[PDB]
């Protein structure tokens, strides 16, 4: 029953004059905040995204960030100017800052990546390079640690603010986080990369929360050749998943797709290959089969 709060920032520097920084904020797999480079203030993506903070203290925090965004840009650019021949554009900086909740305990983090590789973290009071990190980053750390004011104001956020805030989000969005959405399932098939073999597909779309159970069954026998695919998102913050089974042509019969989900409350979705339903569904989706995947 864990919850991870993530503030993601992506900063792009193409040259000495061009830059943009966009940010997104997730509570688990639900987005709570967006902040485009184009926008002046942080936008909410939920009605409870402000947590349990009053206006006159949210605005103080938004100003904290507003000043940070402008400053961060000009700071990186000056560090580039400092490592002039050594490092040059284009530069991609990524920042992942947040805190994981647990009783009253928590554990905060701030990770930084340079050009996709993670190199710097905030630890205790100062910025630190990680083991394996390149040694050219050494001076830029010495420079950034001389900033006592920022270090202090970062320490406040990680030690106090993040935890105190998230507890408020978990309460405010209690209703949305515990929401249950019914998955819908259907069947299809495809030629396997193997000769004379067929790949059965079991599409499971629109379930929430993420955790789900999908297996091809032969009665009481879970087919151990079942490959669970990766979770794919939907526009309404629900989840899509497919489970495939590689069968020999003619071996399709008797097989079923069993779907377990918390929202179903015991009554599993069971789709039988060759069911009058399956026969009816497939007719409702026939096509010209171009340009199908090879």
């Amino acid at each position: 029953k864990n919850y991870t709060f993530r503030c993601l920032q992506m900063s792009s520097f193409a040259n000495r004059s061009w830059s943009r920084t966009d940010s997104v904020v997730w509570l688990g797999d639900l987005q709570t905040h967006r902040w485009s480079n184009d926008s002046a203030t942080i936008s909410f993506t939920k009605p409870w995204s402000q947590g349990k903070l009053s206006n006159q203290q949210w605005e103080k925090l938004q100003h904290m960030f507003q000043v940070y965004r402008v400053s961060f840009t000009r700071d990186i650019q000056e560090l580039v100017k400092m490592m002039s021949p050594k490092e040059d554009y284009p530069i991609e900086i990524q920042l992942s800052a947040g805190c994981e909740m647990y009783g009253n305990a928590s554990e905060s983090f701030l990770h930084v990546a340079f050009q996709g590789k993670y190199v710097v973290r905030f630890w205790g009071t100062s910025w630190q390079t990680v083991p394996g990190a390149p040694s050219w980053l050494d001076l830029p750390i010495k420079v950034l640690n001389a900033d006592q004011g920022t270090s202090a104001t970062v320490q406040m956020l990680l030690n106090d603010t993040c935890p105190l805030f998230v507890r408020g989000l978990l309460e405010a969005g209690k209703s949305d986080l515990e929401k249950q959405e019914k998955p819908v399932a259907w069947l299809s098939s495809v030629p396997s990369s193997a000769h004379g073999h067929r790949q059965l597909v079991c599409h499971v779309s629109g379930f929430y929360p993420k955790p789900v159970w999908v297996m091809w069954m032969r009665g009481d026998q879970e087919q151990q050749g079942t490959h669970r695919g990766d979770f794919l998102p939907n526009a309404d913050e629900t989840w899509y998943l497919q489970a495939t089974l590689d069968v020999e042509a003619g071996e399709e019969a008797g097989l079923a797709c069993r779907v377990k989900h918390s929202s179903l409350g015991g009554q599993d979705i069971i789709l039988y290959w060759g069911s009058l339903h399956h026969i009816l569904d497939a007719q409702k989706m026939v096509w010209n089969h171009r340009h199908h995947h090879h």
Partner: T-cell receptor
Amino acid sequence: TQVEQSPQSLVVRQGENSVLQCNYSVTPDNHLRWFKQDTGKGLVSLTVLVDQKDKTSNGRYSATLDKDAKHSTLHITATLLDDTATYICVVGDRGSALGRLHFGAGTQLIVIP
Amino acid sequence: AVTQSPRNKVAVTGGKVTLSCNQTNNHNNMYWYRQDTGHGLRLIHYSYGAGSTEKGDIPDGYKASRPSQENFSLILELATPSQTSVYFCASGDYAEQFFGPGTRLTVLE
């Protein structure tokens, strides 16, 4: 200009109190520093102000800072003849090497004996 | 202590002038400002170390160069009457900058 100083010039009778003003629109405002420039030389740093609401004292110079008002005041108590100089208000926008200093036009203080 | 040479200079339009600035403080950063009445110091060029040079706020007509740690020179390739000003040099490793004695430069028609 992001840093503004009142008055343009100030005239005080030797051995009285002289008060200098500074207003700024610099963001972020990390620290504020006052300088004394004697006619025909460089800048010498008198005092530094760091905190949201700060106060500082150096011999007979004392200074305040209200970051909320973005305002600063320099006091010289019991002014001397050798205090005739231009006093310059400087706001630094970072607490590190990557900062850029913002300079006021300076107040010119002339002490009539 | 931060030294400057020259202290005074009289120059013509289209002449090459070089203001030298020396420091034994062992600072990495060095700044070139100019002071004109009713303004307050303005940034021309600044360095982050040996071999570095960065355009400041008003670098037009000016070309600074830093050969070594100690020295930092400001070069005017072709001088202008408008470049008549008092030029302060600074250096710093808080972020306290330390200012030079200033060069008074007059460039005539």
